[PDB]
Each structure stands twice: as C-alpha cells, then as structure tokens.
Amino acid sequence: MDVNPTLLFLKVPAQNAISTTFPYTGDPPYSHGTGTGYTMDTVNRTHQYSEKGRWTTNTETGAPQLNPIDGPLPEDNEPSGYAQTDCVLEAMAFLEESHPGIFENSCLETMEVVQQTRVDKLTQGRQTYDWTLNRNQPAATALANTIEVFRSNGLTANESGRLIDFLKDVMESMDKEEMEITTHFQIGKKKQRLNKRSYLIRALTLNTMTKDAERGKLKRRAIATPGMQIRGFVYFVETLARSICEKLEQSGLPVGGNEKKAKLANVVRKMMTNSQDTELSFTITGDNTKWNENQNPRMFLAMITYITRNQPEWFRNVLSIAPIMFSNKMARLGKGYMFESKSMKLRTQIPAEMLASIDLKYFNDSTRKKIEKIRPLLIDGTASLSPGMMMGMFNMLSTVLGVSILNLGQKRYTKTTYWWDGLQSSDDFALIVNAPNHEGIQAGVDRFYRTCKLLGINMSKKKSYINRTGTFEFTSFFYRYGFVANFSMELPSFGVSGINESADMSIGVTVIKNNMINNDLGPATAQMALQLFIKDYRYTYRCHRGDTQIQTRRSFEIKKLWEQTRSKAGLLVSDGGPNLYNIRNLHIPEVCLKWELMDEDYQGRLCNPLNPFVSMEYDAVATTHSWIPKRNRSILNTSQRGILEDEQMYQKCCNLFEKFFPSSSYRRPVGISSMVEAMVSRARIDARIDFESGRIKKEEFAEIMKICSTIEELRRQ
Amino acid sequence: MEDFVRQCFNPMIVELAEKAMKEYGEDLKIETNKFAAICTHLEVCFMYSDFHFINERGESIIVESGDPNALLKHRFEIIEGRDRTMAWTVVNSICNTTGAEKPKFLPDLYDYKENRFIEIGVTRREVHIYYLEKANKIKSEKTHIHIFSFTGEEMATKADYTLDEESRARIKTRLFTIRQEMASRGLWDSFRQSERGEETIEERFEITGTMRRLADQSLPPNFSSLENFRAYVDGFEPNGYIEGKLSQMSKEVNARIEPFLKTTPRPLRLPDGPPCSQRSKFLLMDALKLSIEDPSHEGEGIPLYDAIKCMRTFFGWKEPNVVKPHEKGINPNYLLAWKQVLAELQDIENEEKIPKTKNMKKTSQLKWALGENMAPEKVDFDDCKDVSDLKQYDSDEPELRSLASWIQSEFNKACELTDSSWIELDEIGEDVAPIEHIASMRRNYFTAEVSHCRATEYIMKGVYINTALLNASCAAMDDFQLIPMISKCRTKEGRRKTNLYGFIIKGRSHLRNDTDVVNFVSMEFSLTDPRLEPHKWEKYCVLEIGDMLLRSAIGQVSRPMFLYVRTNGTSKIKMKWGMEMRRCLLQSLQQIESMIEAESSVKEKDMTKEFFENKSETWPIGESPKGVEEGSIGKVCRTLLAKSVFNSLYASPQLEGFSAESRKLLLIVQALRDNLEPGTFDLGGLYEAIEECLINDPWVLLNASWFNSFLTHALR
Amino acid sequence: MERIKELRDLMSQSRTREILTKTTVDHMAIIKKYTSGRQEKNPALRMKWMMAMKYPITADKRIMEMIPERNEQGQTLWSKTNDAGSDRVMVSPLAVTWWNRNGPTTSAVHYPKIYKTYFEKVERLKHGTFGPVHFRNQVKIRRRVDINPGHADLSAKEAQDVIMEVVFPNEVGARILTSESQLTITKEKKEELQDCKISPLMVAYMLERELVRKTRFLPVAGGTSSVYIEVLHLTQGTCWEQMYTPG
RNA sequence: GGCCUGCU
RNA sequence: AGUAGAAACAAGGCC
C-alpha cells in the first residue's frame, strides 16, 4: 500500500475534509531582506494597468502623475484602471435609489462623529510613518512628534483638543514656506529646515515594507503605512464608509465571521430556493485580481462628492481631503539593497534614496529593468503612486463600490430575464446569478464582468469558478448546503500567546472555549488541545507540576513552594500546581477555579496588591503572575537614545497628574489648560473645601496655597 | 481692531479670552466682537469678585485692595473662565460640599456665605429682555442672576443686588467708559448688531492655498477645478451612461464560461531535474536508538548522563571511516568532529559531576562545519564601489529537482505502528459531565490508536530538538554546545525506556531577526547503507562507526552501523514552530472527530466505539498496484497525523502556494463529482499557478503526485 | 500637601517644567502612550525566546528591598539593571515564585468582591445539575445574544456615567443622571461602597464588569438565557446536546 | 584584548 | 560549506 491522504477525498467530500488541505502546522513564509523590489514592482505594475491615461506634472510636488479616469475602454481581459466617472456616479445614484436616504443619514452620523472627535483618537493605532524621523513609530509617538513640531513652528490650533483642529493645523502647515524639524546625531540636536516642497513630499509619502507570516502565497507582498497628516482624514472617511456599509445588506466587511456566514446563508436562501422550477441558479466564487492597483483615489473622491451632496461645505471639504492626498501620495521605496562581493568577501548596504543615482551595474536583469522603468517617477527618494491605492486604507469604500455593482443587478436595472445578487468583501465575493437558461446565466455573468471593468474592478479568472448554487466559498468559509467547520485556520492560536502566565492561561482556555462554540471544536479535540496547551505552558514558563523531577532554572523554588503548601490542588499551574481545567471549566478563570483550595498563606502572597510585579477578550484575575516582560533594549546603541529619558519624564508627570486627578486613568482627561495649571487649580479648590469642612486646617491650608502661588510664579517665569 | 482690545483690557483678561475662544475652535481674526464680549464678561466677573474678602464669619470686608493677610477668604469663587473640565470640577466639588443644587449650566461665580451660584451677563440691549432670556434658559433656578448693560443699567432677581452699591457703580462706570471709547472709534455700531450672531458658532473647515491646488489636480481629466467637479456631481442625473459604454465596449471583454468535464482536467506537470534530497532536520525512518531502560520521566534526567549511559550499553565501536562523502565539503572535518565528540563524552564521564550543559572546544573542524567567519565583512558603499565582483545578492528561482521515490516510502513508514508509546499527555480536571466522559472515551481511543506511531515519535523528536536548540541559542550565543538527541518511550510491557538518536553541535546563535540562521552539526546513528539511495544523502557525510548484532533466526546478522553527519541550519521562527509540532495531533484527531460526529448525527447515538472496535467502515487511504486500498478509522487517523507531521517538518512557501492553488482545483473537481455543472473562466491560469510552486521540495512534489493520482482515480 | 510639594519639585527642573507648562490636558493621554517600545507582532516567539534568558520579566524597584538578591541555593532573583525606558528593574521568574512562598501576606477577603462575577460563575457551575446527553442533529442558528450574566441593562456610556458618579463624584462633569433607574443604582452601589479601601480604579472596573451589558453574535441552539449562553461550549455541539441546569 | 545589544 | 529562496543569514556597532 502506497499511502495517499488525497484519496480520502474519494469518499469524504472536499468541504467535509477541507482542514486536511491547510498546512497550518508549519512555519509560515517570512521575508528575509529588503522590500524595495516588491515596492518597485507594485509601482511599475499599477502604472502599467493605467499607462493609457493622461500624464501630468504636479505643480506642488513637481512629480509625474497618471490619470486613467475616463480613459479608453479596455479591449482585453487584462487588469484595467480606466474607471469611468459617469459609470461610478450612476452606480452611486442607483445605490441611493434602492436605499433612499442612506447617504444623508450616514452623512449625519459622520458629521456628529467629526464634530465630537478628539485628537487622542489618533493614538489608537499601530506603526505609523513619523515624517519627523522618516521612520515607523507607534501611533502615539508619531502623534506627539507631529504635535511638538507644529507647536514649535507656530501651528497650535491642536491645543483645542479636537481632531478637526489638528486637521486644520495639518492643512495650514501645507502653506508654510518652510518648516523646521529636529535631528539627532551620534549626543545633541540639530535644527533642519525643509522647504514647502520637501514638507509636501514628506507629508504625502507612505512608508513601504514587506508582509510576513502570509499563508497561502508563494511570493512575498509589499504593504504600506501612512503618515500622521492623512490619518485623521482617513479616520473620518472610514467612519462615513462604515456607516454606509452597516446599512447595506450586501456588505460583509464591517461584521464578524458568524455574521458573514449568516449573510451568505440568507442570500443563498433568498436566491436559490425562491427561484422557480424553470429558473437556473449558479454561484461564482470570485476573487478580484490586483484589487488595490486598480482603485484610483480620484474615483473615491467622486464617490465622496456624490455621497456628501446637499451637505455643509465644511463637511464636504474635510471628507474630500483624504482622497485628494491619496491621489498625490508618494511611496517610499524601502530599506534599499544589499550587495555582495565574493572575491573580496564583503557586503554593502545602499539605501533606496540612491536608486535614482546608483549605477545599474550591480543589479540583476529584473531589478535593472524595475529601476529603469521606475526612475522617471522617483522624486526625492520616493516614487509617485497616483494611479491607484497601495494597500487597503479604504476597504470600506471599496466594499461600498462592490456592493453598488452587486446592487446594479436587481432586475430593475438589468431589464432582462437574468439577475444577480450575493455578498462582497474587499477583494473577495460570492455572486449568485439566476436566469431561465444557461444562455441567460452566461449573459448575466458577462454583463456583471463588463460592468465591473467599467468601474476599475477586475475579476480574477484564474482564482474564480462558477458552479450550481448550493456549494461555494467565501473568505475561506466553505459553504456546502450549510457552512462547514475549518479548524485548521484556528490551529495557530492554540499555543501560549506570549503575554504572561495568567494572560496566557486565560487566553488559551478562552480560545479553546470559543472554538468549541463557533468553529465546532469537538469535546475530545478540546480536551487534547487543553492537555497540549498545558504541556507547552509548563515547558515555556518552566512551571512543572512540582511533583515531577524535571530540573529547570525555576524548579527549586517550585519544589519548595510545593512542599510548603498543604493543599497542593490550589496552586496555580504557573506555581507547579495540578490542572483542574475541563470542558465545564473553560469559562472560569484559574484563580477563581482554585480559590477555595488555596492555602491562606499562598492565597495572600499570590493575590497581594503590594506585589512589585503587576503594573480576543479574556477574563483575568490580577496576580503576581501578571508581570510585564522586559523590553527590546536595543535603543542604547542608536542616535534615538534620548527617547527613553523623555518617556520616563512623561510617565512621572502623568503619574503625578493622576495623583491630582483620580479619574485620569479611567477616562482620559479633557481640557485646554496646561497640566501644571490644572493641577494647581485642583489643589487650590481641594485645599479650600478641605479647610472649610475637612481634614485640612488653617495653617497647612495657607502653606498649601503658598506652595501653589510659588508654583504658578515659577510657571509664568 | 485687536490693538484696541489688547490696549484697553488687561493682558490677563485677553489671554483668558483667547483661551476660551480657542477652546471651542473660534478665531479672534474672524470673530472679533465675540473676543471683545468675552473680554468684557471676564473683566466684569473678576471685578465683581475682586477686592471683596469675606471676614471670619458671615459678612464681608470691602477691602481697599488685595492685602497680605491671614484672611485668605473670598466672598465669591470665580467659576467663569477657568476651563470646561476645571469649571465643572469646581462646581461639582462645592455642590457636594455645601449641598447646593447643581446648576444645569455653568454659572459665573459662587457666593459662599449665602451658598448660592451667581450668573453675570453684559447686554447691549435693555437689561430686562436679556434677564428674562436667561431666566427661560435657566430653570430650576435657585441661582442669583445679575445683569448689566453696556449703557450701564442693572437688574437682578428679587431686585436683589448681592454686591454693594459702590462696587457695582465702579463696574457700571468701567462698562460706560468702554462703551463710549469704543464708540469714539465707532465699533459700537458693530457691537450693537453682533450679539445675537455671537452666541452660535459656524464651523469653517475651508480648503485654501496648497491643499486647494492639489484639490484641482485630483479630478477626472476633463475637469479644471474642484468647484466645477462638485457642481457637475451635484447636477448629475443618471441617464443610462453604463448601458451606452457597455454597448461601446469591445465584445472581447467577456467572462465566457468553459465547461469543466471529466476529460477536461490535466495531470499536474512536475519539475524535471536531479532527484530531490532529504532536507529534514533529523533522520526519520533511518534513525537508530540506543536504549538504557531508565525509569525516569520525560524531563527527569540530565541529557548528557543519559547519552553516556546509552552509548555505554552498545559495544562494537570501530575506528570511524568515511563511507559516503559529502561531495561538496570536507569529510575529514566531519570524521574529526565525531572523534572530538567521543573524546569530550569520555572527558565528561571521567569527571565527578555530569555538567547539565557541555560546551565544545572551538576547533578548526567545528569552526568550518558550523560556519564561523563565513559572513562577509560589512562595509560602507563608499569604500567598495570599483570592485568588479560587487553585485546584488543572488536572487533567482530555486534549482529544479525531480521527485524521488524515497519520500513516498518515508511517508509510508511514518504511518505504521510501533511497539512503543510516544505520548503521555498532561492531566485534566476530573470528568463530571456525561459529555466529558464521552470526550474522554473518544480521546482514549484516539491516543490508543495514535501513540504507537512513527509520526508521534517524529513529533517528540522535533519538539525536544527544537526546544533544546532554542534554549541553547538563547543561553549561549557564543559557545559550541553538545546536545544529545533524547526521547523517552513506554514499552508495551509498561517499562520506561530512554533513546539516543545522536548529537547536535550548536554554534554561535546571535539571532537578531526571526529569519537569522543558527548553524549546527547533526550526527545520527543508523543502519541504512548510504550506497543504496545516494541521491537522498546529498548533504550528508556518512561514516561507518560500528557493528550491531540484532536478534535474528539466521544466527546473528552482524550488520554495520553508520553515522550520518551533516551541517544544517535553523531559525527562531523555525525552532519556535518545531517546538509546537503537537498541533498535528490536534489537526488529525479534530478531523477524525468531525467525521465521527457527522456520522453520529444521522445515527442517533455516538459511534466512536463502533468505528474503533467493530472496524466496520473503511476509507480510501492509498493505492496498491492492483488498485485503491481502503483502511479502517485507525489507519485514517495515522495517515492524517503523518500528513500534518510532514507538513510541519517540510514547511515551505511552495507548500502553502500549492495547497491553496490545488484546493481551488480540488473543489472544482468535487463540484463536478456532485453534478453541479461546474465552469471555469481560465483553467490554464490556475494550472500555471499550481505548477509554479512545484520546484524542489520533496513534500510538495509528493503532494502534487498524490493530486495527480487523485485526479486519475476520481473523474470516472 | 504631599502632592503639591512633588509638583513643585517636578516644576523645579527645566525639562519637566517645560513638559508640564507646554503639555495641555487634552494631550495628557498622548504623552502617556509616548514610548519607544513597539508592540510585538509575534508575542509567542519572543516569550519562548525571552523565557530562556536570565531576568526576562520586569518589576518595580521596590523589589530590591522586598526580595533578597539570591535565594537559599544562590540563584539570582533580581538585577539592578533598569528597563529600557522605565525605572523598573529586570528580574527573573524565581522572584515571582519566591514571592509566592516567602513574600508578604495580606488578607484576600476583598478579591471575592473584586471579581464577584467570576466567583458567581464558579458557584453557579458548582451547584449545577447535569443530565443525559442527547445525540441528534443540532439546528444551530446564529443570533445576537447577551453574554454578560449580571447585566443591569445599561449601555457602555450610560453605565460609565454611574461608574463615575459612584467612584469619582467630583469628576462627573456636567452629566446628571436623568433616569431614575440609574439614580437608584447609584444610591444602592454608593450605599454598599461607603467604606471599601480598594483603590478607585479597581472599583470602576468592578462596576463596569458588573453593570455594562455585552452582546455577541454566536450560533445558538435553544437556551438563549444569559446564564445558558455562559456554558454554551458545554451544552451544545455539532451532534450532541447536554442538558444542564445552571445553579 | 575586555565591556554594550538581539523587534528600534 | 550550510540554512534558505526573488533577499537574506552565516553576528552588529563604539573605542
């Protein structure tokens, strides 16, 4: 016998054994070196799908830009970026007609959000391209650097504390002849001055990198991160787009997985069964080829202008600035290139900024051609990327366009025996087409494809197939007369997360529980997952049962703690205690599950607020095991070594402020008063009301007021 | 204009006015009358409060000026002009302390002795109208409203004037002077009219300057400005534009559906070239074990002492010599490294205490085998520009390799049972629910059928080896460490046994990125001659190290004993994922239990017991020369476990790409098998997408061969 | 008194004085998140990698006078090297376990009140009664159900208002509890929290845990009661239903 | 030659 | 050499 697991599909249908086809038990593919080659490929490719457009020289950045809107209609089935303004506007008009008042209500909601949003909202994000350092920095750090630079240059409307005032400062900075930033050298500081054009290019640029841990692809991809000037406009546009999407039944982007499955089941039920005996029904499991490279921000501006019709001009402007900036966006090429010399046995690193002047003798044919083709678009170490979006950032608005295309087939607009419906989430869709005959089915499919080509959307004919309704696929959800469980996609989440002992335990048990609830994880499979998770947990944190004689760095303390305790069933697994978790206990925290079994000494030492250790929703009880792991500590060798002292001092000031304002941690403070002013005013009023009726009496009240007076005198000085 | 409001009003007052306006986003440039009104309000409130300190008990001194005194008391607390947060904080605090009714709107001041809030307003119109306006605005009104006018007249509730006559007259005179002086320039004209407009604020987000010009270059080609585009969109009317250009568009833009029939699918084309070679981190089917029968658990022991004991149980060592050379490295270095390991083992043995972790001397042999000083020197591009060989890093397609028969036989062996149990899982809470008992019974069936399996032994080997390698790499980034390859099994009789597969010499492991490579030298015992499938041992240097006398009926065979020595490398991500190979059990047994539960719904009772004991149902799990062979549930469990284990051992981007692009085709074929009239738009594209991933990975090539076999047997 | 002298001390130095003078209250949050530390993209890999180091965790500097530098066997429990951008020191896991066997002890009577929802779940599971498991095709339909058992029927902000009123009376702001239901909730939870020395923030998170209702869209079959959604993992499956009566 | 760093 | 696969590691930098 020659074992062949694939032959298992000769009896078990593919959807009922699809988990076998997911090799999610091995390491995912990772990018090793630069991501500049991928960025150049993306720029060249998105400029190739629109080469028949109009070429312009931007008067602000002096950069070449390509406009394929209202370009020649495609004569082939290759990817196209020549979207027609009339077609997009008409699709929006029909989408509004089928859902009257959708745009107006969405605009009202977005207006309320815009008028009530604050700058602090921009701190809830991951790596953002800080232009002050030309580097990816956390959202809060980049926001703080931008605010500091604006205040230094004289743009202080952000002091109002409203996000829209920050956007006003962002726009006002565009009209400044020359800005000034600070640079660190290998330590002190140096003031550098940027012209208007340089600041424009730095504010319009997106930093590129390579995407790691990508499952299901042979070649690596390039992703992008925006700056801080464009993120507030993007936030408002995303608010409007999500408001629109929530009111569309053909959109599944803003909802969860189970909601996606419910929407798909509902549409299948409404399409197939209700179809009469003579009507044929088919399902297309479509993926869009080069989705982002053919999404032109000018069409997004057109959609925004249509949606915001009959609205205040300020709202239109603030929601239009984002597509305007993405239409002029620049892409930073990336890390650069590494060269090797075998005879002399050395290696060298060239930054991407040199690609505009480097001699092409060091590159392959592929990279030489990429650089030669992209050089015309290179402006100050960055490439023009006008033709289309780099990666996402408007997934909601792209889904809105896709849902408009889906809604254009209600049989009111086709005016033919065939019609279509379905679900679409950016770069993926399921399309149910009903028509009385195979001729009608194919005519409907052809019209849907051709209308997609008229809006800059392309159907991937290699990754798409059409069968009879009842079986299909959507975002790795395999529907076969009902969605089937795919445990493989969830398998990578069955180890120790890496937060800390208590958090890891809680997260593991909660993940097992949730996959039992949603993803049909079996009882025996759940028990085995629990056992394996506990084994990996003991082996990762060196917390073995203590009765065992496994020798580790942590084993002496665990053995002594084991011997000390009388009731050893109350010890946490991190303290070398037994595992009491089972199918009935997956929703209970370990501390509470073992609470009545702990010894009073151990219980008090573990759950002590005085411990110096304590500083996907999972419940966790605070214990000494909620420590925080160490930090990277690679800062000490870089020029940016002064950030650590600044962080420490900021933490000191914020801790003192919390000491003054107790609720500073529960709800974020609001107010334009400087920190010192607010603290001093609070101290004055508190001492006042305490002296009048409270702990304080006259002499120490006077002393406190004297200290406050000198504090304010020092503030003014 | 603003020169006026700055010259007359105190810089303190104007600064507070600027703070108040910029709090809500107004601009003194556009709304000047509002700025002046705020300044007037703040000054009136302050001078209402100023110079009037309450004495010991309830009554107030109208002091001549701010005096240095122990009586820091004030008849009023100034809530106006602090901040939204601070003003409301003061309001809440004093309301809680004194119990006064909370004002729904921010008041101006709070009088302590009478314990009540006071609202002060300055009016260009007559006082009574403004008073009744704020009376209707302020209901639940226990606060004392006092209203002044720029012309001067006064009013208040109950005709009650809290402030004394002289201070109010001073305030009146100040407002009077402000009004006539401001009129002396004539701005009183604008201040008469601006009152009603000031109260409401109009938001003024406008596009100007640079961002305006950019707005004119972000439109369709036939538009010259954003105003024109916005007007066009506002006047846009749907007039069948989509249909017209659908008619104009060429008919070659189509999605013609190609029927997918039995004769349509084509067998996947596999790459041609030299046969593929073993790439795993250790020998899987060729490994040999040295046993000591140690009653110690999975980690209860010192690996080096266990290795020494396992090597002392075997006698028959010979002067090692090269049998199958590496053919691209130095074989003498491998031989000397093996002898060095032997010498270091003897040295460890002779000493008193067995070290838990042993460092290997960095000799020339291990220096070559572990790749030290191999990385090129990092230089600045300015210092190396004219060097002829300077060029980009070699970035080409991996060399093509043909599929070999050894991988399929290896997978066959990985699915067979053994006479040892390779899994003892942790404990879990005692079962209290009937479903928990059912789960435990099903789990015991699974572990009974899976524990004695070569795939589980491979799982244990990989987990142990990768854990040891990661811990050694982090602990000793500079020292060459010797790590014995140790596993522990349960014989069928119940006795415990420790097994030694060989040794790993780990080199320097200053791993910064997840892809940074740590090199190591693997030395594994075996009985399989390398002269039978040399293409499988391309990167191994195989020595002859001893002889074995294994029990056989033909006297005793006295077979040889080779040592496979090779250089390999691993990564932090690779090591981390190899430390989690036990998810393969989860995948396999989750599929098995999903099948069991699918069959248990149709038959209204659990069917794990019948499936496992009765051996009733069978599934196609392989093909024999006569045809397709089917096996019981246990063989299916073992086969899926081996598939997952080899996915983990032979992970590669090729595997992921092929898995996705072949899942697509398999689902198309399944739709065909269900009579769903499947169709395709570009099948050649899908095939070329599947075939681009088949380059050199033995596992991926074997999977492609399996898919071809499935297509052959399917579609009939 | 103790706060204002510390404020003066911080205002004495030029750098902290500038930070306090220029930083507005609105930006207070931003500077609290200002950090060079980047969030980890692969936490599991680092935790498996960091746990092999000496001193892989961090602790307050207080540990230097609360825990000895070495235990009986001579193994280091903490080091004097500070974290990257903090005053905290880097310490080993032996410092944790040591604290769990020879550290200070306190009365844990408050914790059953702190995490009282979790203890309620514990006791409801303990007193529950099981029954026969019925194997049959489960028609699990996906519905939006409330997960929080002790829901008081308050939204996130509507409940947060009560939280601020009961925990932070003077920081409530301009909001007045309009509904009499919220008012009586405030009365009762203030009556039971007259003197409970635990810090206000844990009280706020207590009351968020207890009052705020939460919804989630899950595949349910039968039940639909808030206490039955708690053990959905234990009462439903693809081919089986476990009859269970929570206590 | 020693020390410093391993996501900055 | 080895890992690996469209670009990298095979330690980095400061005296």
Tokens 């996606």 found at? A260
Return the number of CB contacts < 8 Å for A and B.
577
> What residues contact residue B697 under an 8 Å CB cut-off, 6+ apart?
B276, B279, B650, B652, B654, B655
Overall size of chain B counted in residues? 716
Query: What DSSP character marks residue A508?
Result: H
In this structure, are residues B221 and A67 in contact, taking their beta carbons and an 8 Å threshold?
yes
Dihedral sign for Cα atoms in the order B102, B104, B110, B116: negative
In this structure, are residues A429 and A242 in contact, taking their beta carbons and an 8 Å threshold?
no
**Residues forming beta bridges with residue B541, ordered by sequence position:** B565
* Chain E: bases < 7 Å from a protein Cβ: 1-13
Convert B8-76 into a string of H (helix), E (strand) and C (coil). Answer: HCCHHHHHHHHHHHHHHCCCCCCCHHHHHHHHHHHHHHHHHHCCCEECCCCCEECCCCCCCCCCCCCCE
Q: To the nearest 5 percent, what fractions of chain B are helix, strand and coil?
A: 45, 15, 40
* Degrees, nearest 5: CA angle C72-C77-C79: 135
Q: To the nearest 5 percent, what fractions of chain A are helix, strand and coil?
A: 50, 15, 40
Give the residue among B666, B676, B679, B673 at the shortest CA–CA distance from B706: B666
Half-sphere exposure for C59 (CA within 13 Å, toward CB): 28
Residue A68 φ then ψ, to 5°: -90, 0
Biggest alpha carbon–alpha carbon distance for chain B? 130
Chains that touch B (3 or more CB pairs under 8 A): A, C
Chain C nearest-CA distance from B666, in A, is: 25
In this structure, are residues B567 and B370 in contact, taking their beta carbons and an 8 Å threshold?
yes
Burial of B57 (0-12, 13-18, 19+ CB in 10 A): exposed
Distance CA A377, CA A216 (A): 32
Distance CA B686, CA B692 (A): 10
Strands across the sheet containing A628-629 = A628-629, C57-59, C89-91, C78-82
Q: Is A601 helix (H, G, I), strand (E, B) or coil?
A: helix
In this structure, are residues C238 and C158 in contact, taking their beta carbons and an 8 Å threshold?
no
Q: Encoding tokens for residue A126?
A: 């991951």
Give the residue among A463, A418, A422, A424 at the shortest CA–CA distance from A445: A418
CA distances from B607 to A392, B616, C211, C240 (A): 48, 11, 45, 12
* Nucleotide nearest the Cα atom of A40 (by C1'): E6
Neighbours of A193 (CB within 10 A): 10
The yes or no reply on domain B1-199 and CATH 3.40.91.90 is: yes
Chains that touch C (3 or more CB pairs under 8 A): A, B
Record: contact A485-C17, CB cut-off 8 A = no
Torsion angle defined by CA atoms of residues A143, A148, A152 and A156, in that order, rounded to the nearest 10 degrees: 60
Q: To the nearest 5 percent, what fractions of chain C are helix, strand and coil?
A: 45, 15, 40
Burial of C97 (0-12, 13-18, 19+ CB in 10 A): buried
Q: Which amino acid is at A694?
A: G
Q: Which amino acid is at A663?
A: S
Half-sphere exposure for B176 (CA within 13 Å, toward CB): 9
> What residues contact residue C41 under an 8 Å CB cut-off, 6+ apart?
A212, A213
Q: Are strands A346-350 and B377-380 parallel, antiparallel or unpaired?
A: parallel
- Residue among A213, A592, A612 whose CB faces C122 most closely: A592
In this structure, are residues A58 and A45 in contact, taking their beta carbons and an 8 Å threshold?
no
Half-sphere exposure for A184 (CA within 13 Å, toward CB): 11
Say yes or no: Cβ of B570 under 7 A from any atom of strand E: yes
Q: Which amino acid is at B245?
A: K
E strand segments, A475-632: 477-480, 628-629
DSSP A369-406: HHHHHHGGGEETTEEE--SS-SS-S-HHHHHHHHHHHH
Convert A307-352 into a string of H (helix), E (strand) and C (coil). Answer: HCCCCCHHHHHHHHHHHHHHHCCEEECCCCEEEEECCCCEEEEECH
Neighbours of B228 (CB within 10 A): 13
> What residues contact residue B661 under an 8 Å CB cut-off, 6+ apart?
B686, B689, B690, B693
Query: What DSSP character marks residue A248?
Result: -
Say yes or no: Cβ of B373 under 7 A from any atom of strand E: yes
CA distances from B644 to A11, B205, B580, B696 (A): 20, 59, 12, 20
Burial of A616 (0-12, 13-18, 19+ CB in 10 A): exposed
Q: Encoding tokens for residue B13?
A: 């007052």
Q: Which amino acid is at A262?
A: A
* Nucleotide nearest the Cα atom of B514 (by C1'): D7
Q: Are strands B480-491 and B496-506 parallel, antiparallel or unpaired?
A: antiparallel
CA distances from B123 to B48, B106, B151 (A): 16, 18, 9
Half-sphere exposure for B395 (CA within 13 Å, toward CB): 21
CA of B578 to C1' of D3 (A): 35
Distance CA B442, CA A441 (A): 48
Q: Which amino acid is at B82?
A: R
Torsion angle defined by CA atoms of residues A470, A471, A473 and A477, in that order, rounded to the nearest 10 degrees: 80
Tokens 């159907």 found at? A459
CA distances from A464 to A284, A459, A470 (A): 7, 8, 16
Neighbours of A198 (CB within 10 A): 15
* B62 known ligand binder: no
Give the residue among B100, B190, B104, B98 at the shortest CA–CA distance from B140: B104
Give the residue among B278, B106, B117 at the shortest CA–CA distance from B650: B278
Domain assignments of chain C as residue spans, ordered by start: 1-247
Neighbours of B640 (CB within 10 A): 27
In this structure, are residues A465 and B680 in contact, taking their beta carbons and an 8 Å threshold?
yes
Chain B nearest-CA distance from C88, in A, is: 23
Q: Encoding tokens for residue A29?
A: 């593919």
Distance CA A135, CA B130 (A): 57
* Helical axes B454-475 vs B583-602, angle rounded to 10°: 140
Query: What DSSP character marks residue B535?
Result: G
Tokens 């070329």 found at? B688
Q: Is A501 helix (H, G, I), strand (E, B) or coil?
A: helix
Chain B nearest-CA distance from A345, in A, is: 5
Record: contact A615-C60, CB cut-off 8 A = yes
Biggest alpha carbon–alpha carbon distance for chain C? 75
Neighbours of A438 (CB within 10 A): 14
In this structure, are residues B48 and B222 in contact, taking their beta carbons and an 8 Å threshold?
no
In this structure, are residues A38 and A354 in contact, taking their beta carbons and an 8 Å threshold?
no
Q: Encoding tokens for residue C75?
A: 């193994």
Record: contact A218-B651, CB cut-off 8 A = no
Tokens 């302390």 found at? B97
Torsion angle defined by CA atoms of residues B394, B396, B402 and B403, in that order, rounded to the nearest 10 degrees: 90
Give the residue among B432, B179, B661, A266 at the shortest CA–CA distance from C142: A266
Distance CA B514, CA B575 (A): 10
Torsion angle defined by CA atoms of residues B665, B670, B676 and B679, in that order, rounded to the nearest 10 degrees: 10
Residue B325 φ then ψ, to 5°: -70, 160
Q: Is A19 helix (H, G, I), strand (E, B) or coil?
A: helix
Q: Is A650 helix (H, G, I), strand (E, B) or coil?
A: helix
Overall size of chain A counted in residues? 717
Distance CA A543, CA A550 (A): 10
Half-sphere exposure for A69 (CA within 13 Å, toward CB): 27
In this structure, are residues A459 and A452 in contact, taking their beta carbons and an 8 Å threshold?
yes
Which experiment gave this structure? cryo-EM
Distance CA C235, CA B434 (A): 11
Neighbours of B66 (CB within 10 A): 9
DSSP alpha helix (H) spans, A72-217: 85-98, 102-116, 139-153, 163-174, 196-203
CA of A630 to C1' of D5 (A): 14
* Degrees, nearest 5: CA angle A294-A298-A304: 115
Q: Does B208 touch chain A (CB under 8 A)?
A: yes
* Degrees, nearest 5: CA angle A643-A649-A653: 140
Give the residue among B59, B90, B81 at the shortest CA–CA distance from A687: B90
E strand segments, B280-370: 290-291, 317-324, 358-360
Dihedral sign for Cα atoms in the order B209, B214, B217, B219: negative
**Residues forming beta bridges with residue A432, ordered by sequence position:** A283, A421
**Residues forming beta bridges with residue A195, ordered by sequence position:** A178
Distance CA B453, CA A441 (A): 52
Q: Which amino acid is at A679?
A: M
CA of A609 to C1' of D1 (A): 49
Q: State which H helix or E strand residue B185 sits in.
A: helix B165-185
Torsion angle defined by CA atoms of residues A612, A614, A615 and A621, in that order, rounded to the nearest 10 degrees: -150
Chain A nearest-CA distance from B32, in A, is: 17
Q: Is B162 helix (H, G, I), strand (E, B) or coil?
A: coil
Radius of gyration of chain C (CA): 25
Q: Is B659 helix (H, G, I), strand (E, B) or coil?
A: helix
Query: What DSSP character marks residue A288?
Result: B
**Residues forming beta bridges with residue A446, ordered by sequence position:** none
CA of A338 to C1' of E8 (A): 9
Q: Which amino acid is at A662?
A: P
Which of residues 266 through 295 in chain B touch C, CB cutoff 8 A?
none
In this structure, are residues C57 and A709 in contact, taking their beta carbons and an 8 Å threshold?
no
